[PDB]
């Protein structure tokens, strides 16, 4: 189906559903909560989703957002993701699960229905991720089917970074371009049939999780889908 929206900033948060530890803050989406001294809270997850469902049959989309990672020391965790899932999708486990999976089933592709582009700040030993912080594409598993190194210069830069995520409904390809002002540029693509995974409705949004010493802020967000006909 066809849907489009635009948030140049989040001064208004009108069609955003917040769940878990996510909330609006200084014209941004704060995905994980902070305490009374502004310090990030350990072991929490939060979702900020666009509230209107849409369908993926015979559909392409493009979405772009700006984001900041704020870290308060060496070893931040766990990151955030832009994700697609059914409309009734709950906030799931905190930590390296990124609010998108449950421990039992997190690597079983036949027990999940979720697709994401993750920005991962913590190297999880528990499912032997690659030995660096990374950006990746997830298809029904916390183990990214495609993954690339995310430079620490850029993780810790505290720049306002830009992500472009796009899905070509004809070729069945999801792609992410990520860019940093005077920094690194990242490119990932994967062949995946989203209409086959999600035969019904879905929502798009952001999931963040701690972890420790980390807050994830979305500064701007636009989306357009169109039919491939």
């Amino acid at each position: 189906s066809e849907l489009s929206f635009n948030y140049p900033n989040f001064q208004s948060v009108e069609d955003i559903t917040f769940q878990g530890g996510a909330s609006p803050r200084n014209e941004t989406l704060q995905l994980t909560p902070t305490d009374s001294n502004g310090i990030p809270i350990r072991q929490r997850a939060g979702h900020a989703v666009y509230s209107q469902p849409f369908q993926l049959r015979d559909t392409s989309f493009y979405t772009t957002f700006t984001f900041v990672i704020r870290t308060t020391s060496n070893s931040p965790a766990d990151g955030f993701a832009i994700f697609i899932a059914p409309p009734d999708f709950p906030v799931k486990r905190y930590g390296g699960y990124l609010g998108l999976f449950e421990p039992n089933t997190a690597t079983n592709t036949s027990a999940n229905k979720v697709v994401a582009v993750e920005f991962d700040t913590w190297v999880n030993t528990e499912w032997k991720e690659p030995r660096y912080r990374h950006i990746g594409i997830d298809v029904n598993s916390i183990v990214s089917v495609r993954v690339t190194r995310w430079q620490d210069k850029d993780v810790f830069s505290r720049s306002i970074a830009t992500a472009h995520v796009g899905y070509d409904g004809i070729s069945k390809i999801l792609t992410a371009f990520v860019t940093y002002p005077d920094g690194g540029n990242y490119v990932l693509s994967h062949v995946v049939d989203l209409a086959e995974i999600f035969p019904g409705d879905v929502r798009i949004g952001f999931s963040g999780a701690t972890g420790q010493y980390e807050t994830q802020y979305i500064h701007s967000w636009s989306f357009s889908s169109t039919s491939t006909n």
Partner: peptide
């Protein structure tokens, strides 16, 4: 290292 399995 492992932190919650």
């Amino acid at each position: 290292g492992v932190t919650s399995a």
